[PDB]
Amino acid sequence: FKEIESHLVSATARKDAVEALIAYFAYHRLFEALFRCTLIEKEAYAAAAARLERCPEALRLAVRHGVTTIRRKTARAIIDHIVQVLPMPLLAGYVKVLYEFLDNPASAENIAALSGEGWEVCVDFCIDVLSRFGTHVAVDVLSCLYMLCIAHNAPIQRKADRLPHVVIQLLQLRQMKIGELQKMAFATFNIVFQRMQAEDVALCKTLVKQVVPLLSHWWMLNSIRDEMLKTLYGTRLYIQALLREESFPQDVEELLDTLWCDYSRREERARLQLDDITFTNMLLPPDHPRTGIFSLRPHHTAGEQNWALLENLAILEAAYSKHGNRVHQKLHSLDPAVRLSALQLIPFLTRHKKPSLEDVAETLEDLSKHVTAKQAIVASWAMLACSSLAIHEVSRHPSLSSSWKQLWQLAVRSLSLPPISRASCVLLNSILKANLIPRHELADDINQIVTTADISGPAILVDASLGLMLNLLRFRNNMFPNASQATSNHIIRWVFVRWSPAELTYASLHGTHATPYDLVNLLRACYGISPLVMAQPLRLFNGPIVLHWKEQAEMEPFIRYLLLLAGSNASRRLALELFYPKVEELQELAESWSMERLRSMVLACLTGALLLPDLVNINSSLSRDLESAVFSIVDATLKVILNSPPSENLFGMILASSAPYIPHLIEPELIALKRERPHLLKFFGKLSEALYERSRRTLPRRDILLSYTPEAFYLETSLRIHFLDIIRLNDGEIGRIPEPIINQLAGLSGEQFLCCREFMREIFTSDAIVPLGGATTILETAGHIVSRYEYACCEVALCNCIDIMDSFINLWTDNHFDIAEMAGDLYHYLVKQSLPNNSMSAAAQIRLASLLLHLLEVKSEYASNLGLPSSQSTLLKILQDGPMKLKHYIGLEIPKLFGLYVLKTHDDIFVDVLEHLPSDPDVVEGLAFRLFVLAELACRWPTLLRRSIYHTFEI
Numbered sequence: 001f002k003e004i005e006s007h008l009v010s011a012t013a014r015k016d017a018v019e020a021l022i023a024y025f026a027y028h029r030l031f032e033a034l035f036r037c038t039l040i041e042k043e044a045y046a047a048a049a050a051r052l053e054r055c056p057e058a059l060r061l062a063v064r065h066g067v068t069t070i071r072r073k074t075a076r077a078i079i080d081h082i083v084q085v086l087p088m089p090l091l092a093g094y095v096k097v098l099y100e101f102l103d104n105p106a107s108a109e110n111i112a113a114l115s116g117e118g119w120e121v122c123v124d125f126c127i128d129v130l131s132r133f134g135t136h137v138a139v140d141v142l143s144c145l146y147m148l149c150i151a152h153n154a155p156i157q158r159k160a161d162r163l164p165h166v167v168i169q170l171l172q173l174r175q176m177k178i179g180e181l182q183k184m185a186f187a188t189f190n191i192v193f194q195r196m197q198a199e200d201v202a203l204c205k206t207l208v209k210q211v212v213p214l215l216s217h218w219w220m221l222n223s224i225r226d227e228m229l230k231t232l233y234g235t236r237l238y239i240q241a242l243l244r245e246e247s248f249p250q251d252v253e254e255l256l257d258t259l260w261c262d263y264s265r266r267e268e269r270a271r272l273q274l275d276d277i278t279f280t281n282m283l284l285p286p287d288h289p290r291t292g293i294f295s296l297r298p299h300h301t302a303g304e305q306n307w308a309l310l311e312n313l314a315i316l317e318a319a320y321s322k323h324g325n326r327v328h329q330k331l332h333s334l335d336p337a338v339r340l341s342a343l344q345l346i347p348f349l350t351r352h353k354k355p356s357l358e359d360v361a362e363t364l365e366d367l368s369k370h371v372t373a374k375q376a377i378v379a380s381w382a383m384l385a386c387s388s389l390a391i392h393e394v395s396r397h398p399s400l401s402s403s404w405k406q407l408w409q410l411a412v413r414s415l416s417l418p419p420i421s422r423a424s425c426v427l428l429n430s431i432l433k434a435n436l437i438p439r440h441e442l443a444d445d446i447n448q449i450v451t452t453a454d455i456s457g458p459a460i461l462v463d464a465s466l467g468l469m470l471n472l473l474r475f476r477n478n479m480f481p482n483a484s485q486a487t488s489n490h491i492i493r494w495v496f497v498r499w500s501p502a503e504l505t506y507a508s509l510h511g512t513h514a515t516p517y518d519l520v521n522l523l524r525a526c527y528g529i530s531p532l533v534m535a536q537p538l539r540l541f542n543g544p545i546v547l548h549w550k551e552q553a554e555m556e557p558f559i560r561y562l563l564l565l566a567g568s569n570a571s572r573r574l575a576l577e578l579f580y581p582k583v584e585e586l587q588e589l590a591e592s593w594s595m596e597r598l599r600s601m602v603l604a605c606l607t608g609a610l611l612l613p614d615l616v617n618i619n620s621s622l623s624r625d626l627e628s629a630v631f632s633i634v635d636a637t638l639k640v641i642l643n644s645p646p647s648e649n650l651f652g653m654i655l656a657s658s659a660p661y662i663p664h665l666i667e668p669e670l671i672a673l674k675r676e677r678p679h680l681l682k683f684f685g686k687l688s689e690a691l692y693e694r695s696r697r698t699l700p701r702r703d704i705l706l707s708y709t710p711e712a713f714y715l716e717t718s719l720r721i722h723f724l725d726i727i728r729l730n731d732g733e734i735g736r737i738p739e740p741i742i743n744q745l746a747g748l749s750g751e752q753f754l755c756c757r758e759f760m761r762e763i764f765t766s767d768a769i770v771p772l773g774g775a776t777t778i779l780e781t782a783g784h785i786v787s788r789y790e791y792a793c794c795e796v797a798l799c800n801c802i803d804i805m806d807s808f809i810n811l812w813t814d815n816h817f818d819i820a821e822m823a824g825d826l827y828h829y830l831v832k833q834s835l836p837n838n839s840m841s842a843a844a845q846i847r848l849a850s851l852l853l854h855l856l857e858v859k860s861e862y863a864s865n866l867g868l869p870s871s872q873s874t875l876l877k878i879l880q881d882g883p884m885k886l887k888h889y890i891g892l893e894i895p896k897l898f899g900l901y902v903l904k905t906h907d908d909i910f911v912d913v914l915e916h917l918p919s920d921p922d923v924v925e926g927l928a929f930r931l932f933v934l935a936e937l938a939c940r941w942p943t944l945l946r947r948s949i950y951h952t953f954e955i
Contacts, residue, residue: 056093
């Protein structure tokens with residue numbers, strides 16, 4: 001465009017060129033040519049606006065091809081440009097520019113580094129607009145202002161003087177019903193406030209004292225009905241610190257009124273359907289959401305809004321009934337849509353309100369007036385809601401005990417009801433387990449069912465059922481151990497009869513429940529052989545509404561203080577035989593081949609490959625005719641798993657279900673797997689090269705929470721298998737990292753390196769012999785990615801390299817190796833260029849800080865060899881100036897800094913720490929943190945108790 005740009009710098013000798021690039025649709029040449037071209041057009045100012053209602057249409061597109069390959073020197077000028085050009089002439093055209101400039105997210109993360117200068121005036125540009133405010137101007141000014149604030153290192157503090165008052169003044173008008181004006185705002189007052197909750201608390205107690213009225217008046221629309229669930233989670237604390245103080249409890253009236261004004265006209269569509277919760281007993285991570293009896297369904301994403309709507313209520317109504325029986329007023333409320341709502345909500349409220357005898361026996365007496373219903377839900381839900389009350393130290397007062405035997409037989413008469421049987425298993429389960437009945441008294445009730453298997457026998461063969469009989473099966477073996485072999489034999493056949501994996505009635509409406517862990521663990525006690533391993537917590541993936549909550553529960557306990565609140569095979573023969581018709585039962589569908597019917601066929605094999613080795617000890621010519629048999633079904637699936645349209649996600653079905661059995665890839669636990677269950681390994685071995693087929697035919701989120709997205713779990717697990725199979729074939733690679741995987745890790749596409757940061761930490765953490773090019777190349781890759789202006793200021797990129805270094809805190813703290821110069825070469829980038837520039841975030845410094853601690857616990861003089869200050873002052877330099885999520889993390893870990901010192905040097909360092917803690921008189925948001933790290937040294941080391949008390953009293 002040499003002379004084509006000569007047009008740009010006349011009346012139409014230049015306008016024509018502008019319309020030529022539009023046909024087409026270093027840029028510093030074009031833009032700064034275009035800016036002056038836009039200048040010439042500016043002096044034109046009704047017959048003159050056609051060259052400035054179209055010039056921004058270049059300014060919005062002249063960058064889409066370089067908005068990736070724009071650098072920082074450029075956009076700075078672009079900002080001053082747009083701020084000065086309009087110092088709606090060209091608003092609706094200029095406003096669309098930044099919304100087509102901040103969607104390459106690396107923009108609002110590298111205009112906020114280096115004293116955030118590029119970040120400074122953009123936000124002033126954006127805020128002056130909303131103060132003015134054509135609707136179509138806001139929805140791209142507030143959609144970019146929000147597209148700024150959602151950035152990890154967004155210095156909101158030095159601009160939160162006016163911004164928290166800008167969105168809320170936009171929302172302060174209760175008109176223009178709903179859209180993005182209420183979804184590119186309501187998504188900020190979470191991402192903005194959630195940053196200033198643990199600092200500037202005087203700001204927020206007053207802020208959220210206003211938004212609650214705005215929260216009780218907004219009731220595809222679930223696009224917004226997800227934010228208000230994120231806005232309640234991140235705030236449920238403050239609303240228990242204002243209720244401890246008069247028009248605010250004049251609002252919480254209506255807001256908790258709404259949570260019964262919305263559940264009503266939703267009786268039909270979906271209100272926490274009983275399939276969306278599971279009663280199993282696998283070991284789950286304590287992050288997980290539960291209610292003290294059941295738990296949310298792993299790997300189910302669409303079923304989160306309801307449990308989130310309910311938990312919030314029973315976490316915000318047990319706070320307005322304590323501080324201020326407002327619930328039970330809605331128990332005798334004669335409105336069915338306003339009863340089952342309060343009927344599901346019992347176990348939630350049951351968690352933390354702990355009613356005493358005024359409300360316990362008040363409740364139970366009406367529930368037993370519903371447990372005898374004939375509806376499928378009420379006769380199920382009301383059975384749950386009572387088991388919730390069952391687990392209390394304030395429920396074994398026998399002045400109400402009759403209900404717990406009135407309702408006892410209610411299920412022993414209900415275990416035969418097809419739509420009402422599972423929540424009936426719970427009642428007897430909790431009631432037995434809560435121990436309200438002597439062992440003899442609940443024995444005939446056991447003696448019949450364990451021996452009749454037909455009348456009031458568990459109708460359903462489900463997790464809660466296959467957990468139910470285990471108690472009884474362990475009860476019929478509790479008092480009558482002699483000849484208790486006959487007890488199980490009434491159940492195994494009952495199991496198989498009940499077990500209908502090749503069905504379209506059971507396996508399509510009770511398949512999503514029975515897991516190969518709750519089913520096999522029933523058998524694992526008959527012979528008395530072994531329960532499954534299940535040593536580590538299940539790794540699973542969540543949806544954003546709960547994902548957003550992982551980033552709070554780490555630091556509530558701080559914000560809870562800124563607020564002051566023969567005898568063996570006798571059934572294995574029976575087992576091996578009875579199993580074979582079932583093998584063929586599904587093997588009728590061997591070559592006969594929808595989606596969820598495959599699930600049973602999918603879920604069945606892991607009931608074989610964990611039993612097949614434990615059903616071969618006899619060789620009745622069925623033992624090898626079982627193992628040779630079952631693996632004739634899998635391959636058909638692996639012929640329909642491969643061939644499909646990958647918009648049904650049938651590849652992930654085989655993965656989420658097979659996930660809970662992969663061991664921890666630490667070798668000494670993998671070996672004891674190979675010497676036991678190769679058939680299982682065989683499944684992973686057949687599956688591995690079955691996986692590769694899709695591979696022979698970017699960033700969803702940049703938080704530290706990539707490793708819980710749906711994406712990571714279909715990439716983390718996909719490698720935990722490729723490496724499990726790669727070992728069963730040849731033992732030639734146990735104890736150390738085999739070669740193909742490490743040469744495969746380099747064969748990742750960037751965003752595939754970030755999503756697996758929770759995997760490369762799972763193998764290298766353990767001890768092994770990594771090959772020569774191995775550790776380096778991924779550590780070499782981890783450098784070619786961190787330095788690319790896409791992953792320079794990237795909370796997940798920075799958190800990644802710091803996460804592979806610590807794994808190799810040994811392989812370069814030894815000598816001068818070809819890798820021992822790489823880490824330092826990287827190390828200087830981090831603690832002298834990355835850190836000061838404000839190119840880190842709260843979540844990376846947290847990862848950075850936790851390395852220096854592991855350095856002093858190894859070397860203590862690394863930076864004292866390179867030319868950097870110290871691996872003990874750098875730590876504290878971070879501590880002094882940081883984001884409160886980082887400071888709070890150190891006050892927890894720094895009591896370990898005093899562990900690497902002879903006792904007589906502790907009081908020397910407490911002068912360093914004191915030198916750096918926040919000390920400013922009229923800022924109590926920082927003082928209250930000083931007193932917080934002085935209580936963690938006292939409570940940890942005695943030799944610092946006198947200092948920590950003298951200094952606490954000085955404040």
